[PDB]
């Protein structure tokens with residue numbers, strides 16, 4: 001029986017057998033006051049003693065959020081949907097620790113993605129018992145509020161100041177600072193890791209003065225705050241808060257009255273109107289996201305990055321080979337998970353409209369000009385491939401490269417990976433390739449479990465990735481030093497070296513997407 | 527190994543086996559078939575070409591190194607034999623430039639590029655294709671050992687071709 | 702080799718044999734006796750000490766490396782065993798400084814120097830003997846790998862101790 005005394009009370013955990021060993025999991029520990037009633041849309045408030053043995057033996061509620069009902073019954077999409085009840089009372093975190101209890105273990109804190117509109121820490125692909133077992137690190141993960149409830153912003157107004165879900169993540173990081181030594185953890189060796197919006201969140205904790213001392217290093221998988229979906233302008237946020245108000249009959253003349261009104265709405269009426277706060281959306285819409293609130297984020301983060309105002313530490317950054325494909329089946333014409341999606345030039349052009357709402361005509365021709373000079377015009381999957389690359393390069397890959405470039409110019413070691421392995425079990429079709437989100441199960445070690453029907457080459461790839469992530473967290477260097485592995489070079493402006501992750505053998509290459517990102521990065525920002 | 531390494535101590539031949547048969551992993555049935563081909567190619571052609579280029583360039587001359595990785599759409603040999611010895615030649619001589627010939631369009635374009643690069647090398651000592659936003663071909667130096675890959679999709683600059691293999695053939699094997 | 706390398710594939714053990722028994726030349730009867738001692742010393746002590754020093758120094762700290770080559774005039778072990786493991790110790794602790802003890806004069810002087818060098822290292826981080834026009838002890842760096850020889854005649858600065866041997870133990874052997 002395992003009871004740990006925390007600053008706020010005792011917690012009981014549960015033992016887990018993993019790979020003939022034991023991990024202790026403390027699932028669903030609370031880290032803030034439930035943000036209900038009068039606390040809705042406010043910054044999370046600190047938690048007071050229970051006393052009391054809190055039983056942390058199951059995952060807690062996930063935060064309220066719309067769910068993906070596009071493919072009912074389909075594992076590829078439904079695997080991302082919440083797997084605990086939804087509730088505004090969702091501010092909990094999970095701790096997994098090796099057994100026997102470590103002495104001063106390095107801590108890995110996971111921040112989930114989901115567009116800032118969705119996600120939960122209890123997903124199966126985020127289960128941190130493999131990492132704790134195999135690498136003897138402690139893994140922590142937290143639920144933070146998403147959608148309007150986590151990011152609604154009425155700028156400067158503490159009733160809805162914005163970034164609440166980023167302040168939830170932050171209060172979780174404090175909880176680790178204050179409490180993790182009790183579980184056997186080293187609060188001085190804490191690495192944040194996150195994917196997509198979770199990565200973008202990691203990148204903003206790098207810029208946030210209040211997070212500076214809550215962690216040591218950072219890992220960004222498929223995301224960074226400079227991605228075009230990751231920060232809402234003050235203009236847009238205002239328009240959106242008011243549009244939500246209007247749609248819920250909460251329009252007022254006094255803004256504090258708007259918020260008061262919205263605090264009376266049911267979680268569901270808020271969720272139902274989120275999608276419409278915007279005249280046209282895309283499959284990549286982030287209606288309620290991070291904003292420059294003067295608190296968490298003191299200035300437009302592009303200025304902070306350019307001028308070197310951020311936590312000085314090592315970063316590990318990466319992307320997958322086919323980032324953009326996943327999104328094309330949520331609204332691009334001619335695209336289906338259920339056929340090979342060979343689309344036409346005219347369809348490609350219609351797709352640009354779906355993904356680039358407006359976007360001058362000249363803007364959209366320019367994408368077309370850049371991506372459709374074939375070599376050569378023979379290949380029927382030409383336009384289908386091009387639309388996926390457009391969406392991935394713009395939304396994920398070039399913004400990750402440009403973040404890494406700018407961060408490293410201030411003197412810190414940065415490591416960049418290009419993940420190019422398609423899981424043998426991917427439920428999505430072949431044409432979608434190495435999709436967004438599908439490195440995650442490799443990082444968390446799921447392929448280490450033989451009972452699971454991954455290939456042997458995949459077990460070995462995962463084992464290597466886990467070692468590299470763990471050495472990065474413990475030592476700031478993502479090497480696998482024992483098995484004559486390719487040495488991972490730092491990424492510098494100038495050479496821009498990166499490491500490819502695949503089952504055959506990993507290469508050092510240079511200047512990923514050079515020609516493409518010159519387009520997105522220099523020209524497109526029409 | 528006996529066919530290809532006549533004699534060749536037993537220890538000599540075990541050493542090849544040790545170097546080429548640590549699989550990742552022992553699952554794959556084409557493991558040994560692939561390994562024998564690489565043994566024969568690395569020993570006979572690839573490492574001696576790399577070592578020549580390394581030693582020649584150390585005396586101060588520009589050298590350019592390519593790794594040709596396109597399998598001809600018309601190869602009569604079976605698939606497992608891959609991008610065979612002798613089969614870049616028809617690309618260098620331009621045969622795929624002749625449309626009447628049933629090479630693909632991607633192959634015409636690859637050949638056209640290779641012909642330009644060989645011709646610029648001959649005329650100007652520099653195997654660049656300067657007009658079609660092509661990958662620039664870097665000189666090969668001891669130290670970085672940069673090379674250009676030739677294939678129909680897009681050509682890359684890489685480094686240290688067969689590094690681990692050629693350390694074996696080049697330093698140790700000469701048992 | 703069987704006594705010292707329990708198991709150790711047969712190939713593992715042939716490889717030691719191949720590396721250590723190419724004589725220059727096969728004439729010398731103490732050939733195999735010398736080779737077994739070097740195998741055991743290089744594997745167990747010398748190459749791992751060199752590789753430690755190499756890796757430690759790469760992170761920016763001064764490291765100093767010595768090669769002790771004096772056989773004590775009083776060693777009770779026979780001559781063929783040479784400058785044995787454990788037998789620098791009495792020099793470091795100063796026993797030869799005691800004349801009543803039947804060490805030679807050259808050994809008193811060697812010990813006095815070693816004691817000074819160890820003491821200056823401890824007090825000041827630098828194992829120099831600054832007063833008697835002594836050879837200056839250079840730091841050991843990856844790249845040059847300079848070391849100081851300790852013997853009664855005169856000490857030298859050399860480079861790359863056991864280079865060929867340790868490439869074997871250090872890169873290849875870890876069969």
Ligand SMILES: *[C@@H]1O[C@H](CO[C@H]2O[C@@H](C)[C@@H](O)[C@@H](O)[C@@H]2O)[C@@H](O[C@@H]2O[C@H](CO)[C@@H](O)[C@H](O)[C@H]2NC(C)=O)[C@H](O)[C@H]1NC(C)=O
Nearest residue numbers: 235236237239240242243244245246247276277278279280
């Ligand atoms: C700020 O909002 C308006 C959209 O007004 C919205 O009303 C909301 C409650 C919501 O239902 C939403 O769907 C609706 O659009 C944006 O201007 C809109 O542009 C289109 C173009 O025809 C009009 O049809 C909309 O009605 C028009 N607004 C109106 C009704 O006046 C505006 O773009 C947006 N500003 C942004 C984009 O930041």
Ligand SMILES: *[C@@H]1O[C@H](CO[C@H]2O[C@@H](C)[C@@H](O)[C@@H](O)[C@@H]2O)[C@@H](O[C@@H]2O[C@H](CO)[C@@H](O)[C@H](O)[C@H]2NC(C)=O)[C@H](O)[C@H]1NC(C)=O
Nearest residue numbers: 329331332333334335336337338339340341342343344347
């Ligand atoms: C691949 O499928 C797409 C997706 O739309 C279809 O899904 C199919 C599996 C099928 O059940 C079909 O009934 C369903 O609508 C096809 O795109 C569609 O093309 C059809 C053919 O006329 C149009 O009627 C639809 O407007 C269009 N769907 C939309 C709204 O995007 C696509 O044609 C098909 N392409 C192939 C097989 O290459």
Ligand SMILES: *[C@@H]1O[C@H](CO[C@H]2O[C@@H](C)[C@@H](O)[C@@H](O)[C@@H]2O)[C@@H](O)[C@H](O)[C@H]1NC(C)=O
Nearest residue numbers: 103104105106186188189190216473474475
């Ligand atoms: C735990 O170690 C503390 C220092 O941690 C450093 O060492 C590594 C863990 C590294 O990743 C860095 O994060 C840190 O700088 C030390 O101060 C504590 O006293 C230790 N606590 C124990 C053992 O109880």
Ligand SMILES: *[C@@H]1O[C@H](CO)[C@@H](O)[C@H](O)[C@H]1NC(C)=O
Nearest residue numbers: 012013014053054055056057
């Ligand atoms: C809490 O849960 C544990 C584990 O299932 C159980 O053994 C224990 O009795 C519980 N304590 C109470 C009564 O809350």
Ligand SMILES: *[C@@H]1O[C@H](CO)[C@@H](O)[C@H](O)[C@H]1NC(C)=O
Nearest residue numbers: 252253254255256257258260
């Ligand atoms: C807006 O209304 C709120 C309701 O409490 C009030 O506190 C605030 O002072 C009002 N300000 C004005 C005059 O707009």
Ligand SMILES: *[C@@H]1O[C@H](CO)[C@@H](O)[C@H](O)[C@H]1NC(C)=O
Nearest residue numbers: 460463464465467480482483
């Ligand atoms: C190293 O390879 C061995 C087998 O040779 C494998 O069992 C082990 O898991 C590997 N270690 C890492 C961290 O990759």
Ligand SMILES: *[C@@H]1O[C@H](CO)[C@@H](O)[C@H](O)[C@H]1NC(C)=O
Nearest residue numbers: 635638639640642655657658
């Ligand atoms: C350059 O590309 C053009 C078409 O854009 C092609 O026709 C021509 O043959 C190419 N030139 C070379 C030398 O590759």
Ligand SMILES: *[C@@H]1O[C@H](CO)[C@@H](O)[C@H](O)[C@H]1NC(C)=O
Nearest residue numbers: 810813814815817830832833
């Ligand atoms: C230096 O040499 C002198 C005699 O010239 C000797 O007596 C003395 O012990 C030496 N000092 C050291 C530290 O070697």
Ligand SMILES: [Cl-]
Nearest residue numbers: 079124125441
């Ligand atoms: Cl799964």
Ligand SMILES: [Cl-]
Nearest residue numbers: 345346349368
């Ligand atoms: Cl057109």
Ligand SMILES: [Cl-]
Nearest residue numbers: 376377378379
């Ligand atoms: Cl074509």
Ligand SMILES: [Cl-]
Nearest residue numbers: 511512513514
């Ligand atoms: Cl690329």
Ligand SMILES: [Cl-]
Nearest residue numbers: 551552553554
């Ligand atoms: Cl395998």
Ligand SMILES: [Cl-]
Nearest residue numbers: 686687688689
């Ligand atoms: Cl290679």
Ligand SMILES: [Cl-]
Nearest residue numbers: 726727728729
């Ligand atoms: Cl002789």
Ligand SMILES: [Cl-]
Nearest residue numbers: 861862863864
């Ligand atoms: Cl030597």
